[PDB]
mmCIF file of N, CA and C in Angstrom:
data_model
loop_
_atom_site.group_PDB
_atom_site.id
_atom_site.type_symbol
_atom_site.label_atom_id
_atom_site.label_comp_id
_atom_site.label_asym_id
_atom_site.label_seq_id
_atom_site.Cartn_x
_atom_site.Cartn_y
_atom_site.Cartn_z
ATOM 1 N N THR A 1 -40.177 -0.660 -3.467
ATOM 2 C CA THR A 1 -40.951 0.190 -2.551
ATOM 3 C C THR A 1 -42.067 1.069 -3.144
ATOM 4 N N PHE A 2 -43.287 0.927 -2.587
ATOM 5 C CA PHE A 2 -44.513 1.568 -3.067
ATOM 6 C C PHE A 2 -45.222 2.318 -1.970
ATOM 7 N N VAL A 3 -46.168 3.146 -2.389
ATOM 8 C CA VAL A 3 -46.963 3.947 -1.482
ATOM 9 C C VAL A 3 -48.426 3.701 -1.795
ATOM 10 N N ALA A 4 -49.231 3.549 -0.742
ATOM 11 C CA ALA A 4 -50.637 3.217 -0.899
ATOM 12 C C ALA A 4 -51.410 4.459 -1.281
ATOM 13 N N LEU A 5 -52.241 4.360 -2.319
ATOM 14 C CA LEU A 5 -53.018 5.540 -2.745
ATOM 15 C C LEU A 5 -54.358 5.643 -2.032
ATOM 16 N N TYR A 6 -54.831 4.555 -1.460
ATOM 17 C CA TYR A 6 -56.192 4.430 -0.953
ATOM 18 C C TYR A 6 -56.106 3.553 0.266
ATOM 19 N N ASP A 7 -57.047 3.730 1.207
ATOM 20 C CA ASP A 7 -57.277 2.725 2.218
ATOM 21 C C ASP A 7 -57.763 1.403 1.597
ATOM 22 N N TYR A 8 -57.409 0.301 2.249
ATOM 23 C CA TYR A 8 -57.932 -1.022 1.871
ATOM 24 C C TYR A 8 -58.176 -1.847 3.132
ATOM 25 N N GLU A 9 -59.396 -2.388 3.281
ATOM 26 C CA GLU A 9 -59.757 -3.263 4.392
ATOM 27 C C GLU A 9 -59.741 -4.720 3.948
ATOM 28 N N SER A 10 -59.163 -5.580 4.763
ATOM 29 C CA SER A 10 -58.957 -6.941 4.310
ATOM 30 C C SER A 10 -60.274 -7.676 4.263
ATOM 31 N N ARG A 11 -60.390 -8.570 3.293
ATOM 32 C CA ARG A 11 -61.578 -9.388 3.114
ATOM 33 C C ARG A 11 -61.374 -10.832 3.525
ATOM 34 N N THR A 12 -60.140 -11.263 3.727
ATOM 35 C CA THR A 12 -59.883 -12.665 4.023
ATOM 36 C C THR A 12 -58.733 -12.736 5.013
ATOM 37 N N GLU A 13 -58.305 -13.939 5.345
ATOM 38 C CA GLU A 13 -57.231 -14.096 6.300
ATOM 39 C C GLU A 13 -55.872 -13.788 5.695
ATOM 40 N N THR A 14 -55.761 -13.597 4.375
ATOM 41 C CA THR A 14 -54.462 -13.525 3.750
ATOM 42 C C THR A 14 -54.196 -12.165 3.146
ATOM 43 N N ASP A 15 -55.183 -11.302 3.043
ATOM 44 C CA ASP A 15 -54.844 -9.995 2.488
ATOM 45 C C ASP A 15 -54.436 -9.020 3.594
ATOM 46 N N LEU A 16 -53.770 -7.965 3.174
ATOM 47 C CA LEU A 16 -53.151 -7.004 4.074
ATOM 48 C C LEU A 16 -54.069 -5.802 4.127
ATOM 49 N N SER A 17 -54.456 -5.371 5.317
ATOM 50 C CA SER A 17 -55.140 -4.066 5.414
ATOM 51 C C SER A 17 -54.096 -2.963 5.417
ATOM 52 N N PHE A 18 -54.439 -1.808 4.830
ATOM 53 C CA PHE A 18 -53.501 -0.720 4.911
ATOM 54 C C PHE A 18 -54.223 0.616 4.720
ATOM 55 N N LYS A 19 -53.547 1.684 5.104
ATOM 56 C CA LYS A 19 -54.132 3.030 4.948
ATOM 57 C C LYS A 19 -53.380 3.777 3.852
ATOM 58 N N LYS A 20 -54.082 4.719 3.226
ATOM 59 C CA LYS A 20 -53.445 5.644 2.316
ATOM 60 C C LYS A 20 -52.194 6.216 2.935
ATOM 61 N N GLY A 21 -51.110 6.254 2.157
ATOM 62 C CA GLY A 21 -49.872 6.818 2.606
ATOM 63 C C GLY A 21 -48.870 5.792 3.118
ATOM 64 N N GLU A 22 -49.324 4.580 3.452
ATOM 65 C CA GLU A 22 -48.379 3.588 3.950
ATOM 66 C C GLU A 22 -47.352 3.260 2.880
ATOM 67 N N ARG A 23 -46.164 2.892 3.326
ATOM 68 C CA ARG A 23 -45.087 2.428 2.466
ATOM 69 C C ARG A 23 -44.971 0.905 2.534
ATOM 70 N N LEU A 24 -44.956 0.277 1.361
ATOM 71 C CA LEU A 24 -44.982 -1.169 1.171
ATOM 72 C C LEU A 24 -43.831 -1.629 0.278
ATOM 73 N N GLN A 25 -43.316 -2.805 0.572
ATOM 74 C CA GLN A 25 -42.309 -3.496 -0.217
ATOM 75 C C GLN A 25 -42.921 -4.783 -0.711
ATOM 76 N N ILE A 26 -42.681 -5.089 -1.960
ATOM 77 C CA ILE A 26 -43.157 -6.349 -2.507
ATOM 78 C C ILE A 26 -42.272 -7.494 -2.074
ATOM 79 N N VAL A 27 -42.912 -8.577 -1.686
ATOM 80 C CA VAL A 27 -42.248 -9.808 -1.299
ATOM 81 C C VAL A 27 -42.143 -10.740 -2.506
ATOM 82 N N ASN A 28 -40.915 -11.127 -2.874
ATOM 83 C CA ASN A 28 -40.741 -12.111 -3.931
ATOM 84 C C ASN A 28 -41.140 -13.466 -3.368
ATOM 85 N N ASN A 29 -41.935 -14.217 -4.111
ATOM 86 C CA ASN A 29 -42.303 -15.553 -3.655
ATOM 87 C C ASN A 29 -42.550 -16.408 -4.889
ATOM 88 N N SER A 30 -42.613 -17.717 -4.663
ATOM 89 C CA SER A 30 -42.661 -18.660 -5.780
ATOM 90 C C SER A 30 -44.005 -18.600 -6.520
ATOM 91 N N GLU A 31 -45.082 -18.287 -5.812
ATOM 92 C CA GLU A 31 -46.413 -18.299 -6.439
ATOM 93 C C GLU A 31 -46.513 -17.324 -7.601
ATOM 94 N N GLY A 32 -45.730 -16.223 -7.591
ATOM 95 C CA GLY A 32 -45.848 -15.115 -8.560
ATOM 96 C C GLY A 32 -47.071 -14.222 -8.221
ATOM 97 N N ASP A 33 -47.454 -13.323 -9.148
ATOM 98 C CA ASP A 33 -48.613 -12.428 -8.945
ATOM 99 C C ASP A 33 -49.852 -13.311 -8.922
ATOM 100 N N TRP A 34 -50.905 -12.878 -8.254
ATOM 101 C CA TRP A 34 -52.158 -13.613 -8.285
ATOM 102 C C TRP A 34 -53.139 -12.897 -9.215
ATOM 103 N N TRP A 35 -53.905 -13.680 -9.971
ATOM 104 C CA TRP A 35 -54.809 -13.159 -10.974
ATOM 105 C C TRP A 35 -56.216 -13.731 -10.739
ATOM 106 N N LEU A 36 -57.236 -12.938 -10.978
ATOM 107 C CA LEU A 36 -58.594 -13.477 -10.946
ATOM 108 C C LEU A 36 -58.844 -14.243 -12.245
ATOM 109 N N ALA A 37 -59.254 -15.516 -12.148
ATOM 110 C CA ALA A 37 -59.370 -16.381 -13.309
ATOM 111 C C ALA A 37 -60.693 -17.149 -13.267
ATOM 112 N N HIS A 38 -61.202 -17.448 -14.461
ATOM 113 C CA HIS A 38 -62.366 -18.300 -14.681
ATOM 114 C C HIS A 38 -61.937 -19.591 -15.360
ATOM 115 N N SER A 39 -62.313 -20.738 -14.774
ATOM 116 C CA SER A 39 -61.982 -22.031 -15.344
ATOM 117 C C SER A 39 -63.015 -22.371 -16.414
ATOM 118 N N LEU A 40 -62.544 -22.398 -17.665
ATOM 119 C CA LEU A 40 -63.405 -22.918 -18.748
ATOM 120 C C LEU A 40 -63.683 -24.414 -18.578
ATOM 121 N N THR A 41 -62.825 -25.115 -17.842
ATOM 122 C CA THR A 41 -63.023 -26.538 -17.658
ATOM 123 C C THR A 41 -64.082 -26.864 -16.625
ATOM 124 N N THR A 42 -64.137 -26.124 -15.486
ATOM 125 C CA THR A 42 -65.031 -26.426 -14.373
ATOM 126 C C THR A 42 -66.134 -25.400 -14.178
ATOM 127 N N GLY A 43 -65.989 -24.211 -14.728
ATOM 128 C CA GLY A 43 -66.952 -23.132 -14.503
ATOM 129 C C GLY A 43 -66.720 -22.332 -13.198
ATOM 130 N N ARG A 44 -65.790 -22.766 -12.338
ATOM 131 C CA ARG A 44 -65.499 -22.030 -11.091
ATOM 132 C C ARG A 44 -64.611 -20.840 -11.389
ATOM 133 N N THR A 45 -64.571 -19.900 -10.447
ATOM 134 C CA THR A 45 -63.852 -18.660 -10.674
ATOM 135 C C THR A 45 -63.237 -18.214 -9.353
ATOM 136 N N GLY A 46 -62.024 -17.687 -9.432
ATOM 137 C CA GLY A 46 -61.396 -17.125 -8.247
ATOM 138 C C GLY A 46 -59.912 -16.957 -8.505
ATOM 139 N N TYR A 47 -59.174 -16.552 -7.448
ATOM 140 C CA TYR A 47 -57.817 -16.112 -7.698
ATOM 141 C C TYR A 47 -56.861 -17.290 -7.831
ATOM 142 N N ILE A 48 -55.872 -17.155 -8.717
ATOM 143 C CA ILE A 48 -54.894 -18.229 -8.920
ATOM 144 C C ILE A 48 -53.473 -17.677 -8.868
ATOM 145 N N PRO A 49 -52.487 -18.558 -8.604
ATOM 146 C CA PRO A 49 -51.099 -18.103 -8.571
ATOM 147 C C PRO A 49 -50.519 -18.192 -9.955
ATOM 148 N N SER A 50 -50.061 -17.070 -10.480
ATOM 149 C CA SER A 50 -49.814 -17.017 -11.933
ATOM 150 C C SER A 50 -48.660 -17.915 -12.348
ATOM 151 N N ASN A 51 -47.700 -18.155 -11.464
ATOM 152 C CA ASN A 51 -46.652 -19.093 -11.878
ATOM 153 C C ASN A 51 -47.136 -20.505 -12.060
ATOM 154 N N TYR A 52 -48.399 -20.816 -11.754
ATOM 155 C CA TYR A 52 -48.870 -22.188 -11.912
ATOM 156 C C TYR A 52 -49.427 -22.436 -13.278
ATOM 157 N N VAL A 53 -49.494 -21.421 -14.130
ATOM 158 C CA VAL A 53 -50.143 -21.582 -15.417
ATOM 159 C C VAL A 53 -49.232 -21.056 -16.520
ATOM 160 N N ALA A 54 -49.623 -21.336 -17.759
ATOM 161 C CA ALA A 54 -48.923 -20.808 -18.938
ATOM 162 C C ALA A 54 -49.892 -20.538 -20.075
ATOM 163 N N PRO A 55 -49.594 -19.588 -20.962
ATOM 164 C CA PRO A 55 -50.484 -19.345 -22.102
ATOM 165 C C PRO A 55 -50.652 -20.602 -22.935
ATOM 166 N N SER A 56 -51.843 -20.763 -23.525
ATOM 167 C CA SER A 56 -52.216 -22.016 -24.184
ATOM 168 C C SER A 56 -51.476 -22.191 -25.491
ATOM 169 N N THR B 1 -56.345 -16.678 -22.551
ATOM 170 C CA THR B 1 -56.452 -18.109 -22.232
ATOM 171 C C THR B 1 -55.164 -18.874 -21.881
ATOM 172 N N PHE B 2 -55.178 -19.544 -20.711
ATOM 173 C CA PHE B 2 -54.030 -20.237 -20.122
ATOM 174 C C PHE B 2 -54.353 -21.666 -19.774
ATOM 175 N N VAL B 3 -53.297 -22.423 -19.508
ATOM 176 C CA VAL B 3 -53.409 -23.820 -19.146
ATOM 177 C C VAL B 3 -52.645 -24.035 -17.855
ATOM 178 N N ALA B 4 -53.243 -24.806 -16.945
ATOM 179 C CA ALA B 4 -52.665 -25.019 -15.629
ATOM 180 C C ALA B 4 -51.550 -26.036 -15.724
ATOM 181 N N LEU B 5 -50.391 -25.720 -15.146
ATOM 182 C CA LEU B 5 -49.263 -26.670 -15.212
ATOM 183 C C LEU B 5 -49.261 -27.654 -14.052
ATOM 184 N N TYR B 6 -49.962 -27.338 -12.981
ATOM 185 C CA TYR B 6 -49.869 -28.049 -11.712
ATOM 186 C C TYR B 6 -51.251 -28.024 -11.118
ATOM 187 N N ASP B 7 -51.573 -29.033 -10.292
ATOM 188 C CA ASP B 7 -52.702 -28.922 -9.399
ATOM 189 C C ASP B 7 -52.503 -27.790 -8.377
ATOM 190 N N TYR B 8 -53.614 -27.187 -7.969
ATOM 191 C CA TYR B 8 -53.601 -26.199 -6.877
ATOM 192 C C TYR B 8 -54.862 -26.365 -6.032
ATOM 193 N N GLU B 9 -54.694 -26.516 -4.709
ATOM 194 C CA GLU B 9 -55.802 -26.609 -3.763
ATOM 195 C C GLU B 9 -56.007 -25.277 -3.054
ATOM 196 N N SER B 10 -57.251 -24.855 -2.937
ATOM 197 C CA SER B 10 -57.491 -23.515 -2.438
ATOM 198 C C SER B 10 -57.196 -23.454 -0.959
ATOM 199 N N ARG B 11 -56.695 -22.307 -0.529
ATOM 200 C CA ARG B 11 -56.377 -22.062 0.869
ATOM 201 C C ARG B 11 -57.361 -21.131 1.548
ATOM 202 N N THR B 12 -58.201 -20.440 0.796
ATOM 203 C CA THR B 12 -59.094 -19.457 1.391
ATOM 204 C C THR B 12 -60.412 -19.497 0.634
ATOM 205 N N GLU B 13 -61.328 -18.615 0.987
ATOM 206 C CA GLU B 13 -62.618 -18.600 0.333
ATOM 207 C C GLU B 13 -62.556 -17.973 -1.049
ATOM 208 N N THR B 14 -61.439 -17.356 -1.449
ATOM 209 C CA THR B 14 -61.429 -16.566 -2.657
ATOM 210 C C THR B 14 -60.512 -17.146 -3.709
ATOM 211 N N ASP B 15 -59.687 -18.116 -3.379
ATOM 212 C CA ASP B 15 -58.861 -18.655 -4.455
ATOM 213 C C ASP B 15 -59.562 -19.824 -5.150
ATOM 214 N N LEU B 16 -59.079 -20.123 -6.337
ATOM 215 C CA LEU B 16 -59.704 -21.087 -7.231
ATOM 216 C C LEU B 16 -58.903 -22.368 -7.118
ATOM 217 N N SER B 17 -59.559 -23.484 -6.848
ATOM 218 C CA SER B 17 -58.853 -24.774 -6.978
ATOM 219 C C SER B 17 -58.855 -25.192 -8.438
ATOM 220 N N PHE B 18 -57.782 -25.866 -8.874
ATOM 221 C CA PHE B 18 -57.812 -26.356 -10.227
ATOM 222 C C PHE B 18 -56.839 -27.527 -10.385
ATOM 223 N N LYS B 19 -57.018 -28.268 -11.465
ATOM 224 C CA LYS B 19 -56.128 -29.413 -11.737
ATOM 225 C C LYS B 19 -55.242 -29.081 -12.933
ATOM 226 N N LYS B 20 -54.072 -29.715 -12.963
ATOM 227 C CA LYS B 20 -53.223 -29.662 -14.132
ATOM 228 C C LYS B 20 -54.026 -29.938 -15.379
ATOM 229 N N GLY B 21 -53.814 -29.124 -16.415
ATOM 230 C CA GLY B 21 -54.474 -29.307 -17.673
ATOM 231 C C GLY B 21 -55.705 -28.433 -17.863
ATOM 232 N N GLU B 22 -56.265 -27.888 -16.778
ATOM 233 C CA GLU B 22 -57.449 -27.053 -16.942
ATOM 234 C C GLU B 22 -57.115 -25.829 -17.777
ATOM 235 N N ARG B 23 -58.113 -25.336 -18.488
ATOM 236 C CA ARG B 23 -58.026 -24.106 -19.258
ATOM 237 C C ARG B 23 -58.721 -22.963 -18.516
ATOM 238 N N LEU B 24 -58.003 -21.854 -18.369
ATOM 239 C CA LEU B 24 -58.396 -20.684 -17.592
ATOM 240 C C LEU B 24 -58.311 -19.410 -18.430
ATOM 241 N N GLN B 25 -59.221 -18.493 -18.170
ATOM 242 C CA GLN B 25 -59.252 -17.160 -18.748
ATOM 243 C C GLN B 25 -59.092 -16.171 -17.620
ATOM 244 N N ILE B 26 -58.279 -15.172 -17.845
ATOM 245 C CA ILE B 26 -58.121 -14.121 -16.853
ATOM 246 C C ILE B 26 -59.286 -13.161 -16.894
ATOM 247 N N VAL B 27 -59.764 -12.814 -15.718
ATOM 248 C CA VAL B 27 -60.834 -11.849 -15.537
ATOM 249 C C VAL B 27 -60.243 -10.459 -15.304
ATOM 250 N N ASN B 28 -60.593 -9.494 -16.164
ATOM 251 C CA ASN B 28 -60.174 -8.120 -15.937
ATOM 252 C C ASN B 28 -61.001 -7.572 -14.784
ATOM 253 N N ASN B 29 -60.353 -6.918 -13.836
ATOM 254 C CA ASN B 29 -61.096 -6.314 -12.735
ATOM 255 C C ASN B 29 -60.309 -5.102 -12.259
ATOM 256 N N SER B 30 -60.977 -4.275 -11.460
ATOM 257 C CA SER B 30 -60.403 -2.985 -11.081
ATOM 258 C C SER B 30 -59.216 -3.150 -10.120
ATOM 259 N N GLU B 31 -59.237 -4.185 -9.292
ATOM 260 C CA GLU B 31 -58.178 -4.352 -8.284
ATOM 261 C C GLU B 31 -56.800 -4.485 -8.911
ATOM 262 N N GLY B 32 -56.702 -5.007 -10.153
ATOM 263 C CA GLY B 32 -55.424 -5.351 -10.809
ATOM 264 C C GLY B 32 -54.856 -6.674 -10.232
ATOM 265 N N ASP B 33 -53.584 -6.988 -10.548
ATOM 266 C CA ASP B 33 -52.929 -8.215 -10.046
ATOM 267 C C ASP B 33 -52.782 -8.052 -8.541
ATOM 268 N N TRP B 34 -52.733 -9.145 -7.804
ATOM 269 C CA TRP B 34 -52.478 -9.068 -6.375
ATOM 270 C C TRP B 34 -51.030 -9.476 -6.099
ATOM 271 N N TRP B 35 -50.396 -8.779 -5.158
ATOM 272 C CA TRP B 35 -48.995 -8.974 -4.851
ATOM 273 C C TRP B 35 -48.834 -9.221 -3.343
ATOM 274 N N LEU B 36 -47.910 -10.078 -2.969
ATOM 275 C CA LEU B 36 -47.588 -10.221 -1.550
ATOM 276 C C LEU B 36 -46.710 -9.042 -1.130
ATOM 277 N N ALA B 37 -47.117 -8.306 -0.084
ATOM 278 C CA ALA B 37 -46.446 -7.077 0.300
ATOM 279 C C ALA B 37 -46.236 -7.041 1.817
ATOM 280 N N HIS B 38 -45.158 -6.367 2.214
ATOM 281 C CA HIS B 38 -44.829 -6.065 3.603
ATOM 282 C C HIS B 38 -44.946 -4.569 3.845
ATOM 283 N N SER B 39 -45.720 -4.179 4.869
ATOM 284 C CA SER B 39 -45.888 -2.778 5.210
ATOM 285 C C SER B 39 -44.713 -2.345 6.082
ATOM 286 N N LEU B 40 -43.884 -1.463 5.514
ATOM 287 C CA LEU B 40 -42.839 -0.822 6.339
ATOM 288 C C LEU B 40 -43.446 0.092 7.407
ATOM 289 N N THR B 41 -44.678 0.547 7.194
ATOM 290 C CA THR B 41 -45.300 1.429 8.159
ATOM 291 C C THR B 41 -45.845 0.700 9.370
ATOM 292 N N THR B 42 -46.474 -0.490 9.190
ATOM 293 C CA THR B 42 -47.143 -1.218 10.265
ATOM 294 C C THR B 42 -46.453 -2.515 10.648
ATOM 295 N N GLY B 43 -45.597 -3.045 9.796
ATOM 296 C CA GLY B 43 -44.969 -4.345 10.039
ATOM 297 C C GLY B 43 -45.831 -5.559 9.616
ATOM 298 N N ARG B 44 -47.090 -5.342 9.218
ATOM 299 C CA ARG B 44 -47.953 -6.454 8.770
ATOM 300 C C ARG B 44 -47.610 -6.834 7.345
ATOM 301 N N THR B 45 -48.039 -8.030 6.948
ATOM 302 C CA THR B 45 -47.665 -8.551 5.646
ATOM 303 C C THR B 45 -48.835 -9.362 5.101
ATOM 304 N N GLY B 46 -49.062 -9.241 3.801
ATOM 305 C CA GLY B 46 -50.080 -10.059 3.161
ATOM 306 C C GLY B 46 -50.411 -9.468 1.805
ATOM 307 N N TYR B 47 -51.429 -10.057 1.141
ATOM 308 C CA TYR B 47 -51.610 -9.722 -0.257
ATOM 309 C C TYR B 47 -52.348 -8.402 -0.427
ATOM 310 N N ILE B 48 -51.972 -7.637 -1.453
ATOM 311 C CA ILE B 48 -52.622 -6.348 -1.708
ATOM 312 C C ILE B 48 -53.034 -6.236 -3.173
ATOM 313 N N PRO B 49 -53.999 -5.341 -3.466
ATOM 314 C CA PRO B 49 -54.419 -5.158 -4.854
ATOM 315 C C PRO B 49 -53.549 -4.115 -5.499
ATOM 316 N N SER B 50 -52.869 -4.487 -6.567
ATOM 317 C CA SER B 50 -51.751 -3.642 -7.025
ATOM 318 C C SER B 50 -52.231 -2.300 -7.554
ATOM 319 N N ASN B 51 -53.447 -2.229 -8.078
ATOM 320 C CA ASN B 51 -53.900 -0.899 -8.498
ATOM 321 C C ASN B 51 -54.099 0.063 -7.359
ATOM 322 N N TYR B 52 -53.955 -0.362 -6.102
ATOM 323 C CA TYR B 52 -54.163 0.562 -4.992
ATOM 324 C C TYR B 52 -52.903 1.273 -4.609
ATOM 325 N N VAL B 53 -51.779 0.955 -5.237
ATOM 326 C CA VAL B 53 -50.513 1.522 -4.814
ATOM 327 C C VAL B 53 -49.772 2.083 -6.023
ATOM 328 N N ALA B 54 -48.698 2.812 -5.740
ATOM 329 C CA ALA B 54 -47.808 3.331 -6.786
ATOM 330 C C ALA B 54 -46.367 3.372 -6.310
ATOM 331 N N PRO B 55 -45.389 3.262 -7.209
ATOM 332 C CA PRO B 55 -43.989 3.356 -6.784
ATOM 333 C C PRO B 55 -43.721 4.679 -6.091
ATOM 334 N N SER B 56 -42.808 4.657 -5.112
ATOM 335 C CA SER B 56 -42.596 5.803 -4.226
ATOM 336 C C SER B 56 -41.889 6.930 -4.944
#
């Protein structure tokens, strides 16, 4: 259980909007945390599910 | 630097598609890791930027 420090407005269909002060619980899911990543292989960039990758 | 273990197809405008074997670098950004969260205050659910919250 966490508390929001700041308002946040959603940018896509999958993010959660919330106001400062809201109480949130983290949902365990298979994808793991999401990270912003750059593909050295393709040059594209964007968020990935961290359980899909491993250190080289 | 990481290596993709699985293919991943993007679901939104902000996630990165990639194939097994690709090499990825994590981008440091202010939002921090993103987590799937449920709002006990509003009942809505979806991804949030973890630097926007703190443990209660």
